[PDB]
Design a protein around this ligand. Structure first.
Ligand SMILES: C[C@@H](O)[C@@H](C(=O)O)[C@@H]1NC(C(=O)O)=C(S[C@@H]2CN[C@H](C(=O)N(C)C)C2)[C@@H]1C
Ligand SMILES: [Cl-]
Ligand SMILES: [Cl-]
Ligand SMILES: [Cl-]
Ligand SMILES: [Cl-]
Lengths: 242, 244
């Protein structure tokens, strides 16, 4: 593939006083563009974007039985009201139910989780910091470029997992369906350790083209969180994609 | 299965002067509700709702190579401008590209096509009338009850096809997505044999519940087509099944 720096996108960041990066890749020409090559290569806690490999590994290992599994709420208070209810696998991914995935990670265990992150070439592959929190406050780091490589492998079923399991997770990641296009995506927000990072990663299928994308930004306060989606959306709109 | 009449649903049909049926099943097809017991089991041409089994069959026979198949346009005139382009599976479904599906059916062939429709218990299972048009103007017929049974089997990966291929078709059928709400659906319009019939079939996931649905109605003219969606939408909303 190739990557090129495109300074024009900076307008959307400048207007918002945002420090951040977008990486957008057109599958047919294996060609990516970024507003910031340096930041595109910087490696940050994945936070809830880790739900993507974690769901695959959960299925691969038999910890998650299948896409019809329901994760029941035990009635104990959770950090968000939206998590205080039974959830499907898709629902637990889409509302970012950390408690559900901490449990999955515990059952997966260190030996197996390490093995998969190596197979997946996932970031620095460093799961230090406790088996249920390493993606949230441990030693794990991944870049925007690595996220797009990973998502392309998933799209093509080239990850070291069954196609069945890859498809289940693909199915779960759909976030917008229109007559002209389909969006798969996942957000993250790293807030336990400095610096505070918001992520939005995914891909768009339009006509017979596929566009993979990864976005991250420094988050000053919770009031900036929507720019996580709105800056990349604006860019993708300006490019005539969505 | 068991089918129970909900009297109150008729209001929605008589209020628009529509002859039609809606079938709705919560959790499973074991117990469904309808406005009309007789019509719920009446069988009609599937029209473009047949793209659902045909897509599964195309993948299972290897006629569609895999999820990333592109159906290439050779540049020769097609009947609609929306068809004059390369298409993905989801694209061909969205624009209702009947010529793409007809070429799939020809390559599948009558022997294989008959076998899968019988394994799937798909309507009267009659593919008489020409391999490229039996679902459009031939002898094939299916009811609203049988559509919900078929779609439930698809949802559960219980059709006689690989799980991989069932998942591929399901992704191409998503029409609405929200964190705890997901709709898979397909319209059809049968206009070659009287009476003309409109369909809307599908399923909805809401939180940890699932509902299977099938609607059909007599279509007098094109202007009544939207009802295919709004009458069943209103009834589903009456059951608390509400989208965004
Ligand atoms: C009206 C269209 O949107 C569509 C639909 O309602 O699904 C129609 N369905 C099909 C199909 O079988 O895919 C057709 S074929 C058309 C109707 N009678 C003449 C040929 C149309 C494109
Ligand atoms: Cl495999
Ligand atoms: Cl989040
Ligand atoms: Cl022919
Ligand atoms: Cl025809």
């Amino acid at each position: 593939g190739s990557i090129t720096e495109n300074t024009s996108w900076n307008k959307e960041f400048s207007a918002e006083a945002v420090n951040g990066v977008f990486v957008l890749c057109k599958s047919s020409s294996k060609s990516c563009a970024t507003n910031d090559l340096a930041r595109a290569s910087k490696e940050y806690l994945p936070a809830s974007t880790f739900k993507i490999p974690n769901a695959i590994i959960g299925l691969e290992t038999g910890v998650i039985k299948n896409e019809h599994q329901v994760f029941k709420w035990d009635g104990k208070p959770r950090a968000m009201k939206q998590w205080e209810r039974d959830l499907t696998l898709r629902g637990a991914i889409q509302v970012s139910a950390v408690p559900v995935f901490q449990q999955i990670a515990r059952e997966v265990g260190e030996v197996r989780m390490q093995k998969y992150l190596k197979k997946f070439s996932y970031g620095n592959q460093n799961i230090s910091g406790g088996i249920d929190k390493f993606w949230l406050e441990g030693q794990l780091r991944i870049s925007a470029v690595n996220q797009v490589e990973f998502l392309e492998s998933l799209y093509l079923n080239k990850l070291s997992a069954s196609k069945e399991n890859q498809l289940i997770v693909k199915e779960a990641l759909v976030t917008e369906a229109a007559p002209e296009y389909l969006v798969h995506s996942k957000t993250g927000y790293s807030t336990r350790i400095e610096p505070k990072i918001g992520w939005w990663v995914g891909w768009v299928e339009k006509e017979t083209e596929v566009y993979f994308f990864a976005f991250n930004m420094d988050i000053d306060n919770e009031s900036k969180l929507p720019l996580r989606k709105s800056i990349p959306t604006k860019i993708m709109e300006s490019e005539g994609i969505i």
